[PDB]
From a paper:
Here, we explore the precise structural inhibitory mechanism of actinonin, which is a slow, tight-binding inhibitor of peptide deformylase (PDF), a metal cation-dependent enzyme. PDF is the first enzyme in the N-terminal methionine excision pathway, an essential and ubiquitous process that contributes to the diversity of N-terminal amino acids. The function of the active-site metal is to activate the reactive water molecule involved in peptide hydrolysis. Actinonin is a natural product with antibiotic activity that inhibits PDF by mimicking the structure of its natural substrates (nascent peptide chains starting with Fo-Met-Aaa, where Fo is a formyl group and Aaa is any amino acid) in their transition state.
In this respect, site-directed mutagenesis of AtPDF was performed on Gly41, Ile42, and Ile130. The two most interesting variants, [name] and G41M, could be crystallized under the same conditions as the WT protein. In the case of [name], the structure of the apo-protein did not show any modifications compared to the WT structure and remained in an O conformation (“O” zone). The 3D structure of the variants in the absence of ligand is similar to that of WT, and a strict correlation exists between the completeness of the conformational change and both binding potency and catalytic efficiency.
Author numbering: 1 to 181
The structure:
């Protein structure tokens, strides 16, 4: 298993809905969770680990045996709150890169469980924050897309280094460039 980093093209690709809720969705949830736990994370999307589909493992507690293990197959945020707030956000795709981002405080979500049953849920504080961050992933959106132009200008060299890293490691031109912004 591996975490895909920017600027890898799977992180921006279209993520396919899931339909076969079977032994293999489960296995995949399991292994996505353990990655989430191995990287001290509170949530983690399928594109991040190389697969381009509509899947999220989550636990608000962000900790082994604390909170609840929730899976969100095909999530869709049905409500974002008017109040929004700052936070020094980070991402497993941009290691070491942290900058400020504004996202709505609380969110209303629908999704399907590991059995494919349809539930709802609301969140606030850090869990709605980590949930929005992983939700953008499912949508080919990376958190700097959500940064003002001054905040982004602050991490610009750290992104170009990643870009450069992907070019060196794959022999291909970077699929996208933060200069484009
Ligand atoms: Zn591996
Ligand atoms: Zn396991
Ligand atoms: Zn922790
Ligand atoms: Zn993540
Ligand atoms: Zn991320
Ligand atoms: Zn440049």
């Amino acid at each position: 298993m591996e975490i895909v980093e920017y600027p890898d093209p799977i992180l921006r690709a279209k993520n396919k809905r899931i339909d076969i809720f079977d032994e293999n969705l489960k296995n995949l949830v399991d292994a996505m969770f353990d990655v989430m736990y191995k990287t001290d994370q509170i949530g983690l999307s399928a594109p991040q680990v190389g697969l381009n589909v509509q899947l999220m493992v989550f636990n608000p507690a962000g900790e082994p045996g604390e909170g609840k293990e929730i899976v969100l197959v095909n999530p869709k945020i049905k409500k974002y709150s008017d109040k929004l707030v700052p936070f020094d956000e980070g991402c497993l795709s941009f290691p070491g890169i942290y900058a400020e981002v504004v996202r709505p405080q609380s969110v209303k979500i629908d999704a399907r469980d590991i059995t494919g049953e349809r539930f709802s849920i609301s969140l606030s504080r850090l869990p709605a924050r980590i949930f929005q961050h992983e939700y953008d992933h499912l949508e080919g959106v990376l958190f700097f897309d959500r940064m003002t132009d001054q905040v982004l200008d602050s991490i610009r060299e750290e992104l170009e280094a990643l870009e450069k890293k992907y070019e060196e490691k794959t022999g291909l031109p970077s699929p996208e460039r933060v200069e484009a912004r």
